[PDB]
Design a protein around this ligand. Structure first.
Ligand SMILES: O=c1[nH]c(=O)n([C@@H]2O[C@H](CO)[C@@H](O)[C@H](O)[C@H]2O)cc1I
Ligand SMILES: O=c1[nH]c(=O)n([C@@H]2O[C@H](CO)[C@@H](O)[C@H](O)[C@H]2O)cc1I
Lengths: 807, 807
C-alpha cells in the first residue's frame, strides 16, 4: 500500500504465509477452525521473530570476532511497548506481512492490537532507555541493555467514579514470544552476610544467595541487519517444615516481581535496594566474564563502557571496586582508575524529592562491604577536596558522599560524580542548572567531567511506525533517507509555501483525528467533535508538570462560555492523561478534579460541542502511539527549571502538533530550532522563578488581583465541581493557596493570554499548517540518533557506523 | 540397529536432521559452535514433538465428531518420568532419530540422560496413573488425565553422612517442551465465603477466587496414531500497600506449588485440601463445558465417566451435586442418580494411617457448602441403612460419613462408596480384604458395587523401552504383536528347553548387569562384582514394606561369613533404595541403618567382594528404568495384608528377575500365574497374621528362641553399627522389640531359609534361567492393557478398540 513500508515480493509473501501456517499448526497446536485472533497474533509474531534470529546470531558472532569496545546501558527501566510492528518496520517486512495476512483473510492491524505492552518502566526515563536501544542498534554500536525482567510492570489504570484504581499488569499471562530464557547463564548474587579481614584482605561471608537468570530480547537496528541484545535478569531461589521451605523460595524470587511505580520521587524501601543491587551484581559478572573471553585490567576501559541511567545503578561503582579489589586483588588505586574510566553517569533531575539518599542502616545490613568501600571512597575523595580548597570546611560537608542528620544517608549522586569520568544532563538548560546549583561544588573541582547530551526520541517508532501517513507524504517529497538521518527534515522548509504539501500535511492530521475520535467512541462511550482543536497533555501526573494549570484554563474557558453563551469560541477537545503513583495523594486528587470537571463541562447543554474535557485512561506507550499523531496542541507547561528535558514534547513536534510551553528543559532548544515565532512560549523563565523565591511566593496576591482566577477558586471551594461533597477539593485549594512549590497562580494570566493566541491561529487553517510545517521541518535535532552519536564520540569513545552487515 | 525400534527410512532420517537443525537455529537460537548437549536434547525434543502434534489435533477432532463416552481419570499424582524415548517408542521413530542423530555426530542415549523426570507423584499410586494413561491411549479410549501441574515434584534425595537430605525438584528450570499452556481456558475456583438461602435455594457467596490455568501434555498410544491429553491445572491470582498487594498474589498461586511427599500416610493440612478441591473444581467445569458442546443431564452418565484415584478427588462427589443442584437447578434426587452413575472409586489401601478423614472445622471454613451437601448425603444414606437393617444402631454409627470423637471428621472413603456405582480394589486379595473388613458393612448394603481390578504396568516403558535387549530376543522368536498383547508371552513357554533361548535370556541379563555396574561406578564411587546375585529392594521407605527385614537378612549373611570365613557363599550385591517422607522419623532411621550397614560390610577385608550393601540414592522412575532390567532377585516382602497390590513386583517379573515374596497383594496372582514352584514364597499368610493378633504379638519370644536374631539385636543395641554413637539405633531396637505393627521377627526364620533356597538355585545358572523364562512367559496378565480393558467393560461401559487412526 504505502512506500515507506517496504516491498511485497511474490516470494516473500508466499514464504510468510507458509511459516504462518507452520507456526499456527506446530507451535500453537491450533487449527484454522479453533483459532482466535490471539492465536493469529502469535503465529505472526513467531513468524516475524524467525527473520530476526539469523541476524541476531550473526551480529553476536561479528562482535566476538571484531572485538570492538562494548557499551553497557544499565537501567532499572526499559519502557519498550509493543515489539511486533517495530520489528517489521526495522526489517522491511511491514508490507509483505500485510499482504501475506490479508491473503490469509486476516487484518494485520487488528492482530497488532492484541500484543501487550512491555511496560517495564514508568515514563520519561524508562522510555529514553528504549529509544536509546533502537538508536544504538541503528548506529551499529556493540551495545547491551541490562535490566530486570519484572513479572509485573506499571499497573493498568482504571477510572471508577472518577478515581484511579490500580490493577496488576500481568503482561506475561499468555507468554512473550520475543524473549529467550537463558538458564545456562545463571549467576549468583549475594546479600546480607558480614565482612571478615584476613592476611589477604577483606572477605564477604555468610551471605544469602539469590540466583539471577537472564532473558535475552533482540534489538533490531533500522535496516542494517544489526540485532543487539537486551538482557533482563529474573530472580530464582537456589536449590538447597519441608512444605514451608519450598513455599519460602518465593521470598527470594520477589526481587524481580514488580516495578516500583514512583516516578520522579524516591522511596527508600528495602525491596527497591535489593532490586538495584541485583541488576548491578549480575550485570558486572556478565560484563567481566565477557571481557575475560577475548588478568589485565589496564585495557578494561578500552574494552568496556558502563552507562548509568540516573543513580538507580550507582552500586556499579563500589561493586566494580569490590570485584577488582577483593576478588581480582588489584591495589586500590589502580582499581579506582579503571572504575572511573569505565563509568559515566546521566542525571535526570534536580527535584530534591527525586534524588536517592540511602539510609546507612540499610546499606550496612544488606551490603556491609559496599558501605566500607563507600566510606573509603568518601575519605579519599574528601582528601582531594581539602587539598584543593584548603580550610573550606563547609565545602567538605556539602560534598561528602555521607550526609549527617537524624539518620546518616548516602547521597548516591555524589557517589556517581566521584566515580565517573563524565557526568551529563539531558538538556542544555538542565546541564547549566546542575553546574550552577546542586553540583556547583563538584563542577569547581572537575569542570572537565560535566557535559550535556540533549535527549532525543527515535523517528522509527515516533514517526514511521505510529504515523505512516505523514511519513509517506514526507517520503514523496524528499525520499526515505531521513528516517536514519532526521536532519534531512530541513529540506521540507522549501515546501512551506507549497499549496499541495500544505493540503497534504493538513489532511494527514485530519485523518489521524478521525481515527482517534473513532477509537475514542469504539473503546469508551464518549462523542467528540473532530473539527475541534485537540488540546492534549499526556505524561505522568505530578505537581511540577502542572496539570492543575491546565485545569484552571479549562475551567476559565467554560466560565467565559457560560458568561457570553452566544459568542463564537474556537471549539476544543481537552485531553489530559497519565498515571499517578499509588501513594501520591495530591496526584490522585488532580485526576479526580479532572474527571469532576468533565462531568460538569461535558453535560452542560449550553456548551454544545464547543468544549469537551476528557481524561485518557491508562496512558502507556501504545496509547501514546495513537494520541500523539492526532494532536493539534502539545501542553508542556512545567514550571521553569523542573522538567529536566521532557521527551513527549519532541514526539509531538515530530507529528505536527504546535507547542504551548514554558522555557523549560528541551522546550528551550525546540523553540530555538523552529524559531520562537513558531512556538507559543509563555510564563516565567528560570531567573523569574528565583526572583520570586527571594521575595517569597504569596499566592493570595494573584487571587486578589485576578477576578477570573478568584471565581475558579470560589467554585472549587464551594462545591460547584463536587455537588455531593462540597469539601472534596479543600486539599487542592489549600495547597494552591498556601504551599504551592510550583507557582501555578504566577503563570496563570500569561498562560490564558497565550492560549487565546493559539485559538486565533487555529481560526486560520493555512497559517496554522505552515507553522506546523516549520516545526516538523526543524525537529531533526531531537532524534535519538543524534543523541547517541554524541554519547559515542564524547563519552564512550567509539565511532558510530551506518554500514549494513550482510544477510 | 534392533528390530523392535522401527525403520530408519532414507527419507525419514533426512527429514529428521533438517528439522533438528531448524529447531537448533530458530527455536533454541544457538549455532553449532555454542551449543551444549542440553541444547541438542532440546532440538531433538522439539523435533519429536513435531510428529505428535498432527496426530494430537486429529485425535481431538475425531472425538468431537464421533462423540464417544469420555473417561476422566482424576488423580493428585501422575508419575510420568521422561517423555522423549517413550514418545519415540510409541511413534516408531527410535531407530530413525538414532540414525539421524549419529549422522549429526551425536549420541542419542547421552542426549536422553538430560531430560528431567516429570516427578509429579510419590510412588505406586502416581505411577499407576501414568501406566493407565499409556494403556488408555493404546486402547483408543477417549480418555483424559486430570491433575495439578506442581512446580515442584517429589524432592531429590541426597545422602549426607548416610542421612537423607531433601532438595527441591526444580523440574521446570529449563522449560518443558512437552506441554502447551492453554491460558484461554482459564477457569475460576472458589474458596471460603459463606452460604445464603433464597426463595431460589442456596447461594455460595463472598468467596475468594483462584484461577485455574490448564497445561496440556500429549499422551501417544502405541503405534495407533491416537494421541490423548493430560490436562494439569496451575494456580493463578485474579487481577484485582500496592507493592505488598502484588507480592501477595503468591499466596493464591501456592496451591499448585509443591507435591505433598507423604505416601501411604494422611496429613490433614489445609494446603492439601485446597489442592484437592482445586483440581476437582476446575476439572468438573471443564467436563461440563465439554458435555454441553455436543440442559439435559439424563444422558450425562452415557457421555461421562469419572474415575477417582483413591479418595484424593473425593470432593468430585459433593461438587457435582453442588453444580447440579445449585447452579443447574435439578432436584436433589435426580442429581444424585446422575452423580452415582457418573463416578467410580478405586481404593488403594487398608492401612488406617493412610485413609483420609477431614476435620469438620476445616471443611466448614474452606468449603461451607460442600459440608452441607455432605451432611445431606449422610442423612439420606443412613436412612437407606436404617431401612435395610432396622434397629442396628451400631451399623448406623460405623457407616456414618461423619465420625464422632474429640474432633468430628468426614471419612472420605465412606463418601466415595455412597456416591459411586462401583468400588474396586487393586488386587484380588486386597478386594477380598475390603469386603471382609473395613467395608464389610458397605458390601452387605450393596454387594453389586464391589469389584476387583488387579493392577498392571505398561509393557512399553517397562519392557520395550527400558530393556530393548530382552524385547529383541523375544521378538526374534514370537514376533512383535505381544507388545500390545502381552498374553502372547505364553508362547515363550515352548522355548524353556531351548539351549539357544536359554543362553540369550542369560546374556541379555548379564549385559544389563554390566551396564548397571558401570553406571554405578561412573556416577558414584562404588566397585561391584557383576557376577554376584543382584538383590534389589526398590520402593518408598515404609514400615509395612519391611526394608528392616531385608536388613536383618543382610546382617545375618555377614555374621555367618565372619563366623566361617573360608566357606563358600554365593556372592551378592544387596541394593535397597527409596525415599522417606520428610516427617517420617522411623523411615529416615532405616535409611541411616542401611548405609551404616554398608560402612561396616563394604570395608571388611575378610568379606571380599562376596557381600556388598548399596543404598541407591534418588530412587525415581528413570532410575527404576535402569535397575530393574539389571535385577536378579526382586524383594516383595510386605507383611501379608498390607501391600494393596504392588506394581514394582510386576516390573521385575517382566524383566527376568525371580521373586522372593510374601503372599501379599498381587504377589498372590503372580505366583498363581507362574506356578508356586517358580516363586520363592515364605512367611505368614493373612490368616496367620490374624491368629497372631488374637493371641498377641510378643517379639521377645523370637528373640529368646533364635540365637542368630538375638546376636543382631545385640549388635544394634551395643553400637557395632554406629561405633561413635552407641545409641544411634535405640529407636529401631525399641520398636522392633515393643511396638512392631508389622511383625518383622515373626517372618525372620522363614525368610532366611527361603533366601538359602534362592542362593542354591543361583548356583545352577541353567535352572535359574529356565525358571526366569517361566516367570517372563507368564507375566502377560499384569499388563495395564488387560487392567484398562477390564475397567472399560465392567465399570465405564465402553468398548476398547485396537484400530489405527490414519496419519
Ligand atoms: O524518576 C524519573 N522519572 C522520569 O521520567 N525522569 C525523566 O527523564 C526523562 C529522560 O531524560 C526527562 O526527559 C524528564 O525531564 C525526566 O522527568 C527522570 C526521573 I530521576
Ligand atoms: O498413598 C498411597 N501411595 C501408594 O503408593 N499407593 C499404592 O497404590 C499402588 C497402585 O494401586 C498399589 O500397588 C500399592 O500397593 C499401594 O501402596 C497407595 C496409596 I492410598
Amino acid at each position: 500500500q504505502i512506500s515507506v513500508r517496504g516491498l511485497a515480493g511474490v516470494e516473500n509473501v508466499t514464504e510468510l504465509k507458509k511459516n504462518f501456517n507452520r507456526h499456527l499448526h506446530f507451535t500453537l497446536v491450533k487449527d484454522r477452525n479453533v483459532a482466535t485472533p490471539r492465536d493469529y497474533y502469535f503465529a505472526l509474531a513467531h513468524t516475524v521473530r524467525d527473520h530476526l534470529v539469523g541476524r541476531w546470531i550473526r551480529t553476536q558472532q561479528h562482535y566476538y570476532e571484531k572485538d570492538p569496545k562494548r557499551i553497557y546501558y544499565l537501567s532499572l527501566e526499559f519502557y519498550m511497548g509493543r515489539t511486533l510492528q517495530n520489528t517489521m518496520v526495522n526489517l522491511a517486512l511491514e508490507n509483505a506481512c500485510d499482504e501475506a495476512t490479508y491473503q490469509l483473510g486476516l487484518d494485520m492491524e487488528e492482530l497488532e492490537e492484541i500484543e501487550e505492552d512491555a511496560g517495564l518502566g514508568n515514563g520519561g526515563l524508562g522510555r529514553l532507555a528504549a529509544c536509546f536501544l533502537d538508536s544504538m542498534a541503528t548506529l551499529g554500536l556493540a551495545a547491551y541493555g541490562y535490566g530486570i525482567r519484572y513479572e509485573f510492570g506499571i499497573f493498568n489504570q482504571k477510572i471508577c467514579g472518577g478515581w484511579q484504581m490500580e490493577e496488576a499488569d500481568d503482561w506475561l499471562r499468555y507468554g512473550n514470544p520475543w524473549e529467550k530464557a537463558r538458564p545456562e547463564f545463571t549467576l549468583p548474587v549475594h546479600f546480607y552476610g558480614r565482612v571478615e579481614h584476613t592476611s589477604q584482605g577483606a572477605k564477604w561471608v555468610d551471605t544469602q544467595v539469590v540466583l539471577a537468570m537472564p532473558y535475552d530480547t533482540p534489538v533490531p537496528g533500522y535496516r542494517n541487519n544489526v540485532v543487539n541484545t537486551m538482557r533482563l535478569w529474573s530472580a530464582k531461589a537456589p536449590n538447597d517444615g519441608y512444605i514451608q521451605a519450598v513455599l519460602d523460595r518465593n521470598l527470594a524470587e520477589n526481587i524481580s516481581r514488580v516495578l516500583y511505580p514512583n516516578d520522579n520521587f524516591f522511596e527508600g524501601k528495602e525491596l527497591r535496594l535489593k532490586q538495584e543491587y541485583f541488576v548491578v551484581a549480575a550485570t558486572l559478572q556478565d560484563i567481566i566474564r565477557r571481557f575475560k573471553s577475548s588478568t589485565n585490567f589496564d585495557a578494561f576501559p578500552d574494552k568496556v563502557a558502563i552507562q548509568l541511567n540516573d543513580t538507580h545503578p550507582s552500586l556499579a561503582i563500589p561493586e566494580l571496586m569490590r570485584v577488582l579489589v577483593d576478588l581480582e586483588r588489584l591495589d586500590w588505586d589502580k582499581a579506582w582508575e579503571v572504575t572511573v574510566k569505565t563509568c559515566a553517569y546521566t542525571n535526570h533531575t534536580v527535584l530534591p524529592e527525586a534524588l536517592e539518599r540511602w539510609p546507612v542502616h540499610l546499606l550496612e545490613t544488606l551490603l556491609p562491604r559496599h558501605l566500607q568501600i563507600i566510606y573509603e571512597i568518601n575519605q579519599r575523595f574528601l582528601n582531594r577536596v581539602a587539598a584543593a580548597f584548603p580550610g573550606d570546611v563547609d565545602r567538605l560537608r556539602r560534598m561528602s558522599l555521607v550526609e549527617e542528620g537524624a539518620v546518616k544517608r548516602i547521597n548516591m549522586a555524589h557517589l556517581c560524580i566521584a566515580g565517573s569520568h563524565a557526568v551529563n544532563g539531558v538538556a542544555r538548560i538542565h546541564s547549566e542548572i546542575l553546574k550552577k546549583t546542586i553540583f556547583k561544588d563538584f563542577y569547581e573541582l572537575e569542570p572537565h567531567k560535566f557535559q550535556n547530551k540533549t535527549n532525543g526520541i527515535t523517528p522509527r517508532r515516533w514517526l514511521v511506525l505510529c504515523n505512516p501517513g505523514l511519513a509517506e507524504i514526507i517520503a514523496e517529497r524528499i525520499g526515505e533517507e531521513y528516517i536514519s538521518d532526521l536532519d534531512q527534515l530541513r529540506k521540507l522548509l522549501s515546501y512551506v509555501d507549497d499549496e499541495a504539501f500544505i493540503r497534504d500535511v493538513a489532511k494527514v492530521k485530519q485523518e489521524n483525528k478521525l481515527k482517534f475520535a473513532a477509537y475514542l467512541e469504539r473503546e469508551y462511550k464518549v462523542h467528540i467533535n473532530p473539527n475541534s482543536l485537540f488540546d492534549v497533555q499526556v505524561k505522568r501526573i505530578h505537581e511540577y508538570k502542572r496539570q492543575l494549570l491546565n485545569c484552571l484554563h479549562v475551567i476559565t474557558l467554560y466560565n467565559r462560555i457560560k458568561k457570553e453563551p452566544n459568542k463564537f469560541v474556537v471549539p476544543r477537545t481537552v485531553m489530559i492523561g497519565g498515571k499517578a503513583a499509588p501513594g501520591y495523594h495530591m496526584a490522585k486528587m488532580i485526576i479526580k478534579l479532572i474527571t469532576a470537571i468533565g462531568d460538569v463541562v461535558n453535560h452542560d447543554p449550553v456548551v454544545g460541542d464547543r468544549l469537551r474535557v476528557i481524561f485518557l485512561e491508562n496512558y502507556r506507550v501504545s496509547l501514546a502511539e495513537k494520541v500523539i499523531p492526532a494532536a493539534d496542541l502539545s501542553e508542556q507547561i512545567s514550571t521553569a527549571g523542573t522538567e529536566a528535558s521532557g521527551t513527549g514534547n519532541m514526539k509531538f513536534m515530530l507529528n505536527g502538533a504546535l507547542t504551548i510551553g514554558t522555557m523549560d528543559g528541551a522546550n528551550v532548544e525546540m523553540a530555538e530550532e523552529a524559531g520562537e515565532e513558531n512556538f507559543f512560549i509563555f510564563g516565567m523563565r528560570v531567573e523569574d522563578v528565583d526572583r520570586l523565591d527571594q521575595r517569597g511566593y504569596n499566592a493570595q496576591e494573584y487571587y486578589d488581583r485576578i477576578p477570573e482566577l478568584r471565581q475558579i477558586i470560589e467554585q472549587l471551594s464551594s462545591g460547584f465541581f463536587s455537588p455531593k461533597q462540597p469539601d472534596l477539593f479543600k486539599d487542592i485549594v489549600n495547597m494552591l493557596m498556601h504551599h504551592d512549590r510550583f507557582k501555578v497562580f504566577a503563570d496563570y494570566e500569561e498562560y490564558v493570554k497565550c492560549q487565546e493566541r493559539v485559538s486565533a491561529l487555529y481560526k486560520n487553517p493555512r497559517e496554522w499548517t505552515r507553522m506546523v510545517i516549520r516545526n516538523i521541518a526543524t525537529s531533526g535535532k531531537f532524534s535519538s540518533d543524534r543523541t547517541i552519536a554524541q554519547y559515542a564520540r564524547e563519552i564512550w569513545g567509539v565511532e558510530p557506523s551506518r554500514q549494513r552487515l550482510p544477510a
